[PDB]
């Protein structure tokens, strides 16, 4: 494929044109006075949505270079949503401010590397200021206040989340599913959750969440990489019977196999989903046993010399429900006997006594925490499924949200957290003129969010920014009521963790682009 | 098909232009201060990178003649990387320097050939200056300061390499792979490595290292070329069973069998890699038995009247893992019997005695060294998968790097090795003026690396080049900290082998273009 | 007016291009086998000629920059012709060779100033070998030989020239004019010649030779500058009557006075010619009287308080004929009584005794020389006016030529003088590589002439050059006969003076174009 | 190298050897200066052929960066096997310098080039398919 190469200034400007399109299309939903965007759909009427993340997802530009500018940042922004549960919408505006000024600085002839190192020192310094500004969220009274605020003032959710977490603990796996009738249910089941996600999209059948959901499935646990769906045959016909779904937990599934399942499961024939086994090396085969015991299944390996061809349904493990995220698989209510479960819990907890290292101890305790600890299950009540699917969605969000609040606390929202930290870092300086300009590009950029929300309310950005900047601590501006006051007190706040991811991820991409000298693409 | 021929100067200009593109896109990463290049991908967000080898891999021009110039040098540049493991990026600015000035002189009416000979003399004399400038890396202490420097200051990696080399040797085969848990393991196993690579790409499943990696494969040993995959059938289904890979080591594999494998394996249908037998003539069949003995397989020679159709799984050799480069196949941990093996070594070791020649003897010691010597295996420990694959890559690289340092020592990096070497050949003159101009183009080109580096840091090239030229021995300019001093003491260095390579290859490819008077390609 | 500016190399090429047109159109007449050039006349039939001097005046290009290129060199070549009498045609090809090679050196990256010093040093060296090479021409046998060859083997012309020369001396002033019938005639007449040409063309009524020729004219001698033709009226009307021309010698003639004159003598109303007095200061006025005496006029100096308005016809001096060149005016047969004249001579002559300074003495001797020395006048006889004016032409030429030969001797013709001297200059070197190439460009160009002629004869330039170079002294090739031998002996020779001037002048303009970085011209 | 040298000496054993650098063709043509045909036109043909035989030498010389015309003329002046070594820019006996060609190669090329050139020179019409 004959390529197209653009250099220096010519390349950087295309990139800028692309993130501007992404950003202006995305920045309009920001905050509570955000505007509407229509995403056309081939079938029927367009979708009108104020959710910026949906919008970035539809964004794709025709010019190979322009598209490149936008796709790089669209991608890292999604890492912000992955790490927090919101803020893609934020992160995009932050990277745009840095990139624009950054490219201005580069073009006027200042050094790109110095600028990048400068942006990063401002961000690092900013992260520190944000932790101090940060207010902790540990007691369940606060978690309840947080949950209520994330759910849009529905105290019911605050209560639910507080209760579920009290049940599995601050770090507990908590899950949420549709409710059985008007009434909130909370039940803890045997379950576990590992750091591995789907081996390929398509297996996704709940596009809104971008995750996989299989109910009452068979679980194939194989200690070995599976490359030929030749071995999967004997077992695929057996899951085909009884019409139940399947989840492949192998060391990994590549090429041949992965492809046959991605096609087949998409054709509705036997719904299957595969994910890699947790960790690596020895402790991996160990956790596979943890899962085999948990689901009441058999690990089929080559070492012991067993084969995928020699597996019957009895070897499949089994569970009431599994959710597979972009990078996380979580098993809910495994059919394993508690003697067995608790016994594994026993030996491991006895291994921890035989733990010869701190490292080995951390790892074992991790394993037991998950197994005996379980998985909280929140079933949402509502009455008439319309409201129910709604209240369920609000729970998934306030939950993910609250998770961030307990991990790193919360700071003023409405984009003022960023602005305060920036007003406090005015004197950050670097080693030379260029890095300084950089610290400043960064310091200038943390206002973008706030200014933009303010713009959407139809007020003068410059003004609110000046005014907010004048105060101290969490004093900011409530966009919904156009009143200045304590952001935290008025209900407008953000998990310290999200403002953090959004900023750090924005400067990284801003810095890389600002430090790009060449772009290569295919010919149209 | 009808072609388009451009001649003389007209022809030289298309080429210079193509190489300028390759050169300008590549040279921007060079240094401690190098720039990012954005390489677009049909799917998703594009790649951001500072690795010259990658960008070059992506360079392809729309104009057929321009394309030919750049591709000529892209080709020869990669050979510098294959023989060293870095420096594609260096070699490039180098061909560009020579080509630019050489074609200007040629156009001014100077003799291309005389100039080529002068340049050649300059490079020769220069490599000479380079070995003297060269400082050795022999004692495991240097293998250590160096191995750590290649690893980006991870002393851990350096320790790994001085130890791994310590176990086998300066000349020792060492392979590196994934780790079992946090900790670093090195085990010496029965194994071997030869001067032949895959008979075709596509067989590659590790596009990043550009190598083939098969684990626990069957090895087919036959003594004859295989062009008909008709002969294969009886053995290829036996390998399709057990769903295990297959390594094919034959005198050669052509047309039919080779194409069918490059395809069938490119479809997940049992993975099979092919490579040529080591050596030529009689000693070739001999090395094939060494391989059999080592892996416990049977060599299928038409000479013994055996047939590939008459091959069962038992006759196949087997080993825990094999790695196939562009020019190397290395078999790691063969199932062969230590008794079988040492006995084939006893044999080879007596033949050494009955050696009537210095050459038969030399070829034999080569054989015993491979077998009894074995193969070192470094399993890298990191903890948490991400850290593991990353720390692994640093090891492969530092390994190859140190391999070059032990073999020819080290010289100042930052492109100053070149700027000193040329600087001592100021007085090199030739048989005529044209040749004379040629020496100067070469010597002028040796500053390119340095100059470019300085530019990316945003400083004045001419001044640094001058200042550097003024000192002696290994005195240069440290591009990271902008401080002058002994390059080696400040740790910014390059293996005498790599710098030598980049230079020789640049003059080779630059040299062919200058004398070129004509160019032919298909039309548009 | 709005200008158009082109710079550096862009400029240099346009220039080169223009000089290529002038020189290539001009170079086909060179030598004895030169071709015909057809020059179109708005009226009638075209003019066909083989005279290089004729072609250059008519060359004028449409492109402003190229024409600048052609016109610059066209002028520095006419100077070669004014100085010696031939070589315009020669001087041009010399310049084209140097500019072409020089500019290549420059575009190629070599320095224009070093290149110019080298070229010039080469020209200086060349001039020196040219003198030792020069064969003297002093005795009148040779004068006769020289005149005969320059007049195309007409011994008649040779006899004429030697004779005129023996009469007025080698330095003497000789004029040539139409004959009174078949027979030839020589008569010395009271006269004088000074270093002054016409204050303006147009006064010219003999286009062939570009000179003014007035018969039985009046001479107005005014020690002052005439800017106002108001003062001129009385004298001009007195000159108006009788039906005779007027010569005007004043300190200077500007604007209106000179403008109305340039117009009026061109309308047929009284023919008048104006020229600057010789020398400057005090000596100029004495030389003004040195004329009034010779022709019998009266100097009208404001100093003595005489006005021009009060001038009549008796104040107007007179002679039989006057010729005025681009830079020379020659007075023929003054009416002034010898008495008055030899007495003005005696005077100057005694001033030679009172001269207390070598210089003063030289300035006085110059004047006496002019008056008492008189002027030789050759009147050419031949039977029927056609042959008479033609023999007149051959005489004018052989004369100017013999002048130059007598001043600097003769050297081999056919461009060989130049090739021989350069062959003597191979080891000539300069102060840096760049200058060396300059010397060689110069050394190379010296073969051009010879080459072009060989080119016109249908023989190979490289062969003849190579052959001729191998010899010595005046050995060269006779273009007419295609025979090698001693060039002088065969008859093909050139005055040391024309070859020297064409070359020095070629080096000047070549030095200038080569050292040009900018061009400004009017907008189309 | 063996296949080639082999093939070559085949021709040497078969028809001997001559000066390479295509100086053989130039020596041979130079000995045929008075060769003429039946009518003026055939003569121009003879001179054209005689003229073509220097091509080899001229082109080569052209390639060393020396003057084709000069060396061709200079070479023509000697006798027997005197020619120009392109590798060394030295004149001498081509055979002695080792530079040479199988009598068979110089011969075949000459006859064949003349066959096809003659055919083209006498071609009056050309027919091909439309693009």
Swiss-Prot record, chains A, B, C:
Listed GO CC annotations: cytosol; GroEL-GroES complex; membrane
Organism: Escherichia coli (strain K12)
Signal peptide extent: none
Name of this protein: Chaperonin GroEL
Catalytic activity, EC: 5.6.1.7
Record's subunit section: Forms a cylinder of 14 subunits composed of two heptameric rings stacked back-to-back. Interacts with the co-chaperonin GroES. Can form asymmetrical complexes, composed of one GroEL and one GroES, and symmetrical complexes, formed between one GroEL and two GroES oligomers. The asymmetrical complex is the functional unit. It was suggested that the symmetric heterooligomer may represent a transient intermediate in the chaperonin protein folding cycle.
Known role: Together with its co-chaperonin GroES, plays an essential role in assisting protein folding. The GroEL-GroES system forms a nano-cage that allows encapsulation of the non-native substrate proteins and provides a physical environment optimized to promote and accelerate protein folding, probably by preventing aggregation and by entropically destabilizing folding intermediates. Also plays a role in coupling between replication of the F plasmid and cell division of the cell.
Protein location: Cytoplasm
Residues that hold ATP according to the record: 29-32, 50, 86-90, 414, 478-480, 494
Entry keyword Flavoprotein: no
Processing and modification events after translation: Phosphorylated reversibly during heat shock. Can be UMPylated on a tyrosine residue by SelO/YdiU, probably under stress conditions.
């Amino acid at each position: 494929a004959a390529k197209d190469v653009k250099f220096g200034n010519d390349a950087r400007v295309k990139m800028l044109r692309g993130v501007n399109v992404l950003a202006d299309a995305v920045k309009v939903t920001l905050g509570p006075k955000g505007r509407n965007v229509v995403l056309d759909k081939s079938f029927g009427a367009p979708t009108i949505t104020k959710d910026g993340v949906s919008v970035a997802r539809e964004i794709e530009l025709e010019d190979k270079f322009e598209n490149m500018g936008a796709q790089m940042v669209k991608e890292v922004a999604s890492k912000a949503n992955d790490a927090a549960g919101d803020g893609t919408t934020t992160a995009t505006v932050l990277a745009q401010a840095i990139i624009t000024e950054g490219l201005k600085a580069v073009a006027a002839g200042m050094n790109p590397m110095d600028l990048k190192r400068g942006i990063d020192k401002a961000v690092t310094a900013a992260v520190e200021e944000l932790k101090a500004l940060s207010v902790p969220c540990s007691d369940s009274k606060a978690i309840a206040q947080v949950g209520t605020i994330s759910a849009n003032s529905d105290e019911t959710v605050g209560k639910l989340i507080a209760e579920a977490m009290d049940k599995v603990g601050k770090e507990g796996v908590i899950t949420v599913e549709d409710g059985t009738g008007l009434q909130d249910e909370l039940d803890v089941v045997e379950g576990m959750q590992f750091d591995r996600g789907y081996l390929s999209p398509y297996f996704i059948n709940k596009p809104e969440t971008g995750a996989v959901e299989l109910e009452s499935p068979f679980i194939l646990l194989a200690d070995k990489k599976i490359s030929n769906i030749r071995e999967m045959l004997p077992v695929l016909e057996a899951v085909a019977k009884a019409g139940k779904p399947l989840l492949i937990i192998a060391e990994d599934v590549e090429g041949e196999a992965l492809a046959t399942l991605v096609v087949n499961t998409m054709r509705g024939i036997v719904k299957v989903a595969a994910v890699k086994a947790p960790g690596f090396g020895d402790r991996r085969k160990a956790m596979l046993q943890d899962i085999a015991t948990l689901t009441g299944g058999t690990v089929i390996s080559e070492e012991i010399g067993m084969e995928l061809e020699k597996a019957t349904l009895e070897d499949l493990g089994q569970a009431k429900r599994v959710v597979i995220n972009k990078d996380t698989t979580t098993i809910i209510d495994g059919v394993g006997e508690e003697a067995a479960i608790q016994g594994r819990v026993a030996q491991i907890r006895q291994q921890i006594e035989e733990a010869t290292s701190d490292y080995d101890r951390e790892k074992l305790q991790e394993r037991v925490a998950k197994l005996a600890g379980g998985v909280a299950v929140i079933k949402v009540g509502a009455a008439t499924e319309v409201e129910m699917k709604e209240k369920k969605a609000r729970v998934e969000d306030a939950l993910h949200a609250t998770r961030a609040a307990v991990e790193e606390g919360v700071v003023a929202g409405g984009g003022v957290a960023l602005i305060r930290v920036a007003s406090k870092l005015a004197d950050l300086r670097g080693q030379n003129k260029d890095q300084n300009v950089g610290i400043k590009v960064a310091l200038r950029a943390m206002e973008a969010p706030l200014r933009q929300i303010v713009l959407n309310c139809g007020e003068e950005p410059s003004v609110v920014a000046n005014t907010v900047k004048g105060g101290d601590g969490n004093y900011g501006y409530n966009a919904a009521t156009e009143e200045y006051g304590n952001m935290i007190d008025m209900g407008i706040l953000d998990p310290t963790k999200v403002t953090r991811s959004a900023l750090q991820y924005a400067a990284s991409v801003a810095g890389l682009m600002i430090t790009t000298e060449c772009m290569v693409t295919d010919l149209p």
